[PDB]
Amino acid sequence: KQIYKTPPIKDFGGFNFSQILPDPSKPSKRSFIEDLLFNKVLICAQKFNGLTVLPPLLTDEMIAQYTSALLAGTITSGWTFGAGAALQIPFAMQMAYRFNGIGVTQNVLYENQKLIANQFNSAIGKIQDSLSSTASALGKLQNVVNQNAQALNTLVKQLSSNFGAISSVLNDI
Amino acid sequence: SQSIIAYTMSLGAENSVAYSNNSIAIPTNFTISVTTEILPVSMTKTSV
Amino acid sequence: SECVLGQSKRVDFCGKGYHLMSFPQSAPHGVVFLHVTYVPAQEKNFTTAPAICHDGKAHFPREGVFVSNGTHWFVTQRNFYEPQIITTDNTFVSGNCDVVIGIVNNTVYDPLQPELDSF
Amino acid sequence: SECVLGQSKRVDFCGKGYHLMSFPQSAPHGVVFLHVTYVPAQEKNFTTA
Amino acid sequence: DCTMYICGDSTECSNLLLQYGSFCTQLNRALTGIAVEQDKNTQEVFAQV
Numbered sequence: 130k131q132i133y134k135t136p137p138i139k140d141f142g143g144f145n146f147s148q149i150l151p152d153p154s155k156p157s158k159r160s161f162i163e164d165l166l167f168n169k170v171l172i173c174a175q176k177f178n179g180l181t182v183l184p185p186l187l188t189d190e191m192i193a194q195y196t197s198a199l200l201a202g203t204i205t206s207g208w209t210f211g212a213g214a215a216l217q218i219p220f221a222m223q224m225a226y227r228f229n230g231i232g233v234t235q236n237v238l239y240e241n242q243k244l245i246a247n248q249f250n251s252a253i254g255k256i257q258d259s260l261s262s263t264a265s266a267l268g269k270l271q272n273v274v275n276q277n278a279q280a281l282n283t284l285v286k287q288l289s290s291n292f293g294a295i296s297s298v299l300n301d302i
Numbered sequence: 303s304q305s306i307i308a309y310t311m312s313l314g315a316e317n318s319v320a321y322s323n324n325s326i327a328i329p330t331n332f333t334i335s336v337t338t339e340i341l342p343v344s345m346t347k348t349s350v
Numbered sequence: 351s352e353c354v355l356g357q358s359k360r361v362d363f364c365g366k367g368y369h370l371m372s373f374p375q376s377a378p379h380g381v382v383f384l385h386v387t388y389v390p391a392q393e394k395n396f397t398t399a400p401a402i403c404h405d406g407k408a409h410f411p412r413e414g415v416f417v418s419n420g421t422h423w424f425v426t427q428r429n430f431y432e433p434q435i436i437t438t439d440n441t442f443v444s445g446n447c448d449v450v451i452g453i454v455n456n457t458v459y460d461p462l463q464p465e466l467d468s469f
Numbered sequence: 470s471e472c473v474l475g476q477s478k479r480v481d482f483c484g485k486g487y488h489l490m491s492f493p494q495s496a497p498h499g500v501v502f503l504h505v506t507y508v509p510a511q512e513k514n515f516t517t518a
Numbered sequence: 519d520c521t522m523y524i525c526g527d528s529t530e531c532s533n534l535l536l537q538y539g540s541f542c543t544q545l546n547r548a549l550t551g552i553a554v555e556q557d558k559n560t561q562e563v564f565a566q567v
């Protein structure tokens with residue numbers, strides 16, 4: 130319902146969130162992962178025959194703001210902002226509850242807090258490196274665009290056929 | 303007077319949450335609500 | 351199947367909030383669901399702490415948060431304010447209070463002491 | 470809805486394993502999900518009754 | 519394969535059909551996509567382990 134704002138304090142129990150939080154020192158608010166994905170993934174000719182491409186209603190900056198608000202709410206208020214109002218809660222308590230939700234007692238989190246934080250940081254670093262190195266990981270998106278483009282090409286190519294007449298140029302006949 | 307205007311969308315209001323080490327917000331009251339959800343099931347049977 | 355014939359815990363599936371139950375109604379070529387939902391009302395701030403160290407043994411809550419007023423400490427369910435007196439009944443011990451970050455100091459009352467004193 | 474705004478117990482829905490939380494990210498004409506998952510590592514035999 | 523179905527191994531039939539543009543390629547692409555999709559369906563439904 131409402132765009133949330135992450136606090137300037139980054140004391141999230143040792144969980145380093147700098148990779149996915151919005152980047153302030155950037156022209157836009159897209160994060161490092163978001164910009165990496167954006168970088169990972171002739172037009173006039175189609176328009177020249179009456180095939181227009183409309184612009185999307187929501188620009189990329191609005192989507193980035195929505196995503197940033199969702200992350201801020203998730204990291205600050207847990208899940209309580211989904212149902213009603215936002216209820217602030219310590220992040221460690223939220224993680225203990227998320228462990229309690231899957232059978233294990235909460236005490237485990239407070240026995241291995243630093244180890245879990247280090248594991249999560251290493252995991253986000255590894256996923257960032259995996260996205261940086263290979264380019265096929267975003268195949269599902271890419272195909273879509275390619276597929277769409279292919280169709281349009283064929284349409285324009287259909288303007289070159291004669292369909293049995295003397296010539297394919299309307300002005301000529 | 304009244305006229306047609308154009309502007310930039312607002313994605314709702316702006317809100318901030320006072321996160322800290324040892325602060326917790328606990329509700330004291332509740333509200334029972336009723337929400338309507340409408341789903342289509344079938345069209346008009348027809349033949350030609 | 352889920353919303354009517356049961357209580358589903360899927361978020362935003364049956365209503366918007368904590369789902370309770372639903373009622374179906376007909377409509378021309380369609381159905382209308384009335385979802386009854388429970389939404390938390392006005393809230394209050396409090397000070398918290400992850401655990402309690404009583405006698406060098408960290409204490410953890412069986413179900414609930416350790417809520418704290420400006421003076422005292424209680425255990426409450428998460429979705430409704432309901433203070434309770436700290437007791438060994440609603441808490442359990444797991445190790446000493448040195449690895450836990452955020453530990454605080456407070457006495458943990460025991461229910462056996464009064465009647466063993468009387469006997 | 471389920472993964473972000475809650476803790477889905479539906480097996481293999483959000484990630485592979487016991488689900489903890491998820492983080493969304495934007496992408497050109499799409500969306501990306503980063504699921505945090507809990508998996509056991511070391512196994513030990515025991516006799517039970 | 520279109521040219522074998524539409525045209526009975528005839529030369530002039532193929533010559534006339536060539537005037538109709540790239541109609542065959544779309545059908546072939548759609549059917550190949552359907553076949554690959556069936557393969558992916560079986561792989562996804564069964565290879566859960």
Ligand SMILES: *[C@@H]1O[C@H](CO)[C@@H](O[C@@H]2O[C@H](CO)[C@@H](O)[C@H](O)[C@H]2NC(C)=O)[C@H](O)[C@H]1NC(C)=O
Binds near residue numbers: 146147
């Ligand atoms: C959290 O992770 C970020 C990202 O790796 C860390 O910031 C890096 O710090 C090193 C130290 O020299 C720099 O070389 C990198 O350029 C920094 N990265 C970015 C994106 O700025 C940060 O130190 C980590 N810890 C905290 C508490 O933020």
Ligand SMILES: *[C@@H]1O[C@H](CO)[C@@H](O[C@@H]2O[C@H](CO)[C@@H](O)[C@H](O)[C@H]2NC(C)=O)[C@H](O)[C@H]1NC(C)=O
Binds near residue numbers: 331
């Ligand atoms: C929780 O809220 C309800 C309703 O807001 C309170 O019940 C009474 O509701 C009537 C109808 O609107 C009001 O006129 C009364 O003023 C409400 N009571 C009071 C004391 O204000 C109910 O009391 C509230 N409970 C708590 C614990 O706040």
Ligand SMILES: *[C@@H]1O[C@H](CO)[C@@H](O[C@@H]2O[C@H](CO)[C@@H](O)[C@H](O)[C@H]2NC(C)=O)[C@H](O)[C@H]1NC(C)=O
Binds near residue numbers: 433
């Ligand atoms: C904080 O809240 C508690 C719980 O309502 C208040 O309760 C006090 O508890 C002590 C211990 O039994 C009593 O001696 C006091 O008389 C209680 N307070 C009252 C007003 O009766 C406590 O007072 C609150 N502390 C504050 C508001 O500073």
Ligand SMILES: *[C@@H]1O[C@H](CO)[C@@H](O[C@@H]2O[C@H](CO)[C@@H](O)[C@H](O)[C@H]2NC(C)=O)[C@H](O)[C@H]1NC(C)=O
Binds near residue numbers: 403453454455
């Ligand atoms: C809770 O109480 C314990 C013991 O009553 C405190 O432990 C003392 O901590 C100080 C340092 O702050 C040491 O110099 C003492 O040796 C410790 N033991 C005693 C018997 O005083 C502890 O600091 C208190 N506060 C907490 C745990 O937050």
Ligand SMILES: *[C@@H]1O[C@H](CO)[C@@H](O)[C@H](O)[C@H]1NC(C)=O
Binds near residue numbers: 140321322323
């Ligand atoms: C949280 O704790 C750290 C260290 O204990 C302290 O520096 C910081 O000021 C605390 N934050 C708040 C909001 O109390």
Ligand SMILES: *[C@@H]1O[C@H](CO)[C@@H](O)[C@H](O)[C@H]1NC(C)=O
Binds near residue numbers: 320327393394395
């Ligand atoms: C709780 O504390 C915050 C910041 O200290 C304050 O803005 C708010 O009004 C307080 N009360 C609430 C959230 O009910």
Ligand SMILES: *[C@@H]1O[C@H](CO)[C@@H](O)[C@H](O)[C@H]1NC(C)=O
Binds near residue numbers: 512513514
């Ligand atoms: C349990 O015992 C079996 C049979 O002795 C053995 O094959 C297996 O490796 C043991 N499990 C572990 C975790 O060592």
